[PDB]
Design a protein around this nucleic acid. Sequence first.
DNA 1: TCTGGCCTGTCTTACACAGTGATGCAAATCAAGTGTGAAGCCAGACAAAAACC
DNA 2: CCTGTCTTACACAGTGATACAGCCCTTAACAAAAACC
DNA 3: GGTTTTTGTTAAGGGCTGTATCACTGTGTAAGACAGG
Lengths: 55, 589, 343
Amino acid sequence: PSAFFLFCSEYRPKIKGEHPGGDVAKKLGEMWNNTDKQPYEKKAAKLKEKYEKDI
Amino acid sequence: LSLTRRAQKHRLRELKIQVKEFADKEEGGDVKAVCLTLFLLALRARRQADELEAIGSGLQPAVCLAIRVNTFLSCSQYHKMYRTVKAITGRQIFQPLHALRNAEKVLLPGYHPFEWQPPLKNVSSRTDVGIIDGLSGLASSVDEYPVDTIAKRFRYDSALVSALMDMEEDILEGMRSQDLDDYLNGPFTVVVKESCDGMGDVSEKEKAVRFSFTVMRITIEHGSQNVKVFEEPKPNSELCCKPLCLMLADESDHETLTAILSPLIAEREAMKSSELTLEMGGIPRTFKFIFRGTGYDEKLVREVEGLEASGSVYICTLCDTTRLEASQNLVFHSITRSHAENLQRYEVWRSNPYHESVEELRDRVKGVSAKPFIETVPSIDALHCDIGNAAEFYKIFQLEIGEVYKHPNASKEERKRWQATLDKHLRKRMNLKPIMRMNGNFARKLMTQETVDAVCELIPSEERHEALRELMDLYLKMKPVWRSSCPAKECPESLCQYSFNSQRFAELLSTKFKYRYEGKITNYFHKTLAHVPEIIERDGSIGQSGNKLFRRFRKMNARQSKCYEMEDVLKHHWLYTSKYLQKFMNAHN
Amino acid sequence: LRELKIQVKEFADKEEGGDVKAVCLTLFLLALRARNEHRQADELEAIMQGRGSGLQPAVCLAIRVNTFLSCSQYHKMYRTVKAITGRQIFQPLHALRNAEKVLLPGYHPFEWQPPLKNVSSRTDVGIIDGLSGLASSVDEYPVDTIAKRFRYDSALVSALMDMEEDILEGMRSQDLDDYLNGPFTVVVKESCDGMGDVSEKEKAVRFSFTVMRITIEHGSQNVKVFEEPKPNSELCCKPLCLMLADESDHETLTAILSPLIAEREAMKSSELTLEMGGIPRTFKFIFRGTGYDEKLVREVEGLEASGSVYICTLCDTTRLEASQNLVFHSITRSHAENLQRYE
DNA sequence: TCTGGCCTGTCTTACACAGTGATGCAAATCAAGTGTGAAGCCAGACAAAAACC
DNA sequence: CCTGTCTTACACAGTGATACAGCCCTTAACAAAAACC
DNA sequence: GGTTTTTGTTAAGGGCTGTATCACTGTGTAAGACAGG
Ligand SMILES: [Mn+2]
Ligand SMILES: [Mn+2]
Ligand SMILES: [Zn+2]
Ligand SMILES: [Zn+2]
C-alpha cells in the first residue's frame, strides 16, 4: 500500500463516524502531505520484497 | 463437469438423442448453432459469453495476415511464433498458416466476380484470374529476340475490382457520412492515378520497373452534384500505390518495356469505354473509371511520349518551347502537348511529307522523334519549383557579391572567390553548410528573407538590397501556391495573383538583373514560371523507398526461384497495400 | 428457442440440479468435438475457465530474438494485438529490455576463490571494448578494427545460470539431490573461426565457447549431470568476442585475443562459487580449445602454412615420411613443445 | 584529313533519409476501501413492421 | 620443385506451397473399476 | 457383497491438425589447378 493508502484505510473510521452518508480523508491526507507516514513505507518495502520472492 | 469426455457423453446421451431429434424436427441439424444460442442464453441468465462468441481473445485470420505481412515474418517464423504462443498460453491466439492463406485468397485479385457492360474489348471475361505472366505470352524461342526479363502482373480490371472490394468499408461509411443511403447504386466515378518508375538496382551481392495504380477519389452522382464519398488522404504513400506489374528490366530498355506494358495499356483503354458492375454490401453498384497517368517522372514521360532525351532543346514536356525561347519569354506559354499531338508528330517525322532536311523536320515535329505508346498527364512536383528558384537565387547572390551589374567581365578565379565568399558567409551567419550539388532542403532553407538580409550584409549598394528583397518577396508570395495541398481553399488570393506575381518577377529579372541572362534555363524553372496555374487547374494541386520494399520482400518472403519469386513479391506487395489490413494495423485509434 | 429451453430446463431439473450454465457448456463442447472442430472448443474452454493468456516478458523476448524482429516491428505487432483483443498478450518493449538484462552477462554475482589473477573482481561487467584499451593515437600502430567482447568469466557465469534448469533436472534424473553442492566440473569447448566476408554492398572473426558437459563428484564417481545434445549447433556456440578483422592479420588477432587467453588461464587456477537455486555451488573448469580448423590451429600454434611438408599438426612427420610410413605415428606436438621450438 | 570548341551521354561523387536500439519524460495505471447507479436479462399470452401463398 | 593466390565448383540454407501422418469422433454393445449402502 | 457411476474397450473410416517435404536457387566456402618465384 502507498503511504496515503494505509493512511486512508486507518482514518476511514473517523470520517465515516463524523459523516455517515473518502473525500474527507482525501483532503486531510492532501493538506498534511503537502505540509510520519514512515511506517506505511516500511510495510510497503516489506510486502514488496515478499511479492518479489514469490515466483 | 468434473467428469471426463466419455463420462459426460454417456451421462447425457439420452438428452443428446432427445435434442438431436428436436433439432432434426425443425432446426435442420445445425446443432452447433442451437447449442450456441442455448449456452449464450444460459450465460446471460446467470462478459464470458461475449468472449466465447468471439473465439476477442481470438485474432481473425485477416488480422494475422496483416501482422505477418506487415512485420515481414516468414511463414516458418510465423509458425514458430504461432505454435510457441499457443503452447504457452494454451489458447490459439494466432491462427494457423492455412487460415492465413485462405484469408489471403480474398484480398488478392481474382476472388470476387464482376461484369463489364459492354464486355471489355480484347480482354478475357474470366473473373477467376489472378497473377498472370507479365511477358503476356512473349515468344521465347531461341530464334526470337532474347528475353532477359521475368515479369508478373495482374489483369488491370481484376486489380481495380480487388482494390474497390478492399475499400468497400470506407466507401459505404463515406456515403453514410455524406447523408446518403447505403443501398444507393447510382454511377460512382473513380479517378485513378497511374504511376510508373524504375526501382534502380535491385541486385543482391539488375533493375526493376514497377507499374502501379492509386485510387485517388470516388465520387457519386446524386442530383446534379458529384458527392466525394472517398478521397485518398496520403496520395504519395507506398501504402496506397497498388502494384500491378513487377518486371526485372531496365526502364531504358524500350523493347522490353513496351512488350511488357502494351497489354496493360490495352486493358486500360478498353476500360475507358465501359461500366463495371460489382456487388457491394448486397447491392449491385455501377462504376465508371477516369485514368490519369501522373506518376511518371520526366525521363519516363519523355520515353513513353516519343519525345527526346532530357538534354534536348525542347525542354518542356508540356509545351513546344526551346531552352533559348523559354529563357527569353519567361512566363507566356500554354500547355499545348497532348498524347494525340505527339502521335501525329511522330507520323509526320516518319513520313516527312514536306520533304525537309533533318533539322527542319525536327523543328516541325518539336522533338517528337519516336512513336508514343502511353498517354500521360505530365506534371511537376512541389520540390522542383523551390529547386529551380533556389539555383537562380544562389547564382544571383554570387553575382551580386561581385557587383556584376557594375562590372561586366570576370575571370573564373574571381567567380570562384565570390562563391567561396558567399559559402563562408552563409556557414558563418546562417549555419547552412555549403553544398556542391543542389538538393531539396537546401532550397527550402535558403529561400527565406532572413538569408536575404544576411547576403545584403555583403552588398554595398542598397538599391540592390531593395531589388533582392522584392525578388524574394515575390518568391514567397508564389510559394504557397505550388506547395499547398489545395491552393483553391488554403490560399485563394495567392493563386489568383500567381500570374501577376510571376509576371512582375520576370520583369524584375529582365530589368534590374540583366546580367543573369545567358540563354539557358531549367525544366523546373520554366514550368514554375509558366505552367503552375494551368497545372493547378488541371490537377488541383502540385504538392526513394520502393526499392527497399522490393528487395526486402525478395529476401525474406520469396521462393528462391526465378519464376515464383516475382509472383511471391507481387502477392506480398498487394497484401501490403490493402487498406483492409492497414485498418487492423491502426486498431489502437 | 423457448420450447427447447423449457424442455432442457425440465431435463436438467430431472437429475442435474439446475446449474444449466455448465450443462449447456458441456453439450455445446461435446457437439463441437463431434464436428471435429477441436480448436474452437478448446478456446471456449479456456475462456470459460478464465486462464489468462499473458506471455511473461521472457517469452516475448525469446520470440523476438528467435524470429529476428526489430524493436519497431515487435512494437507494431504488440500494439496491434493489444488493440484488437483488448488484452496485453505480448509485453511492451521495456519489459523485454528488462528481461534481457537477466540473460546477459553481468547480472548475477559470483566469487573466485582464490581471486582471479589479473582479472577484475567486479561482477556487473557487461559488454567490453574488444581492443582492451589498445592504443589508437595517430602515433601508435593504426587500429582499423572494431570488436566487442565479454569478460570470459562473466560470460561463463551468465551461461551457467542460463542452463540452471537443465542442471537441476539432470541431477534429479540421475537420482541426485537438487540442493547438493559438491564440486561440479564444466568442460568448456573454445572455438574460433573467421566468418569470411561480412560486407554489405570486410572480414570478421568469432571467438566462442560451448558448454560441453557438467559432472558432479559424488563419492569417487563423476556422475554426468549435463551433456550438450547438439555440440556443433549455432544454438549453443555461445559468442564471447566478435571482431571485424582478418583471421590472417596476426597483429590484430593477437591484440584482441590475448586478453581472453589471460582470463582463461587465470580461471584454470580457481574455483567459481556461484548461487544456484538458493544453494552456493562450486565449479571447476576444464578448457579444451578444439574448435579450431587446421588453418587457425597452424596460425595460432606457430606452425607453418598448410602447404608445408610438415603436414600433421599432431606429429613431426613429413609428407614423404607419412606416405612411406602409413600407420605408425603417435601424437607428439603440444603447446609446450611448440613454445620451446619457437625458442 | 586535322586542331579546336560544342554535343549527347555515361560516368561520378553527393547528400537526404530510412530505420536501428536506446532514451527520457509525460501520462496512465494499479491497489485497498464503499456509497451509488446501470445495461441487459427474467416469464406468457398476444399483435404489429416486415415478407411468403 | 615450391609456397601461395586466385580460380571456379558444389552443398546447402531457407522461401511459400503442399502431400502425408494422425489422434479424435461416430454407431452400439459390452465390461472392469469405483464407490455408496 | 450389491448397485450405480465413471471409464474404458472393440472396429473401420473420416476430419482438422502440425510437419516433414517439396522444388528450388544464390551464396559462401574450400578444393585445387595453376601462377609466380
Ligand atoms: Mn525515375
Ligand atoms: Mn576457417
Ligand atoms: Zn512549357
Ligand atoms: Zn600425424
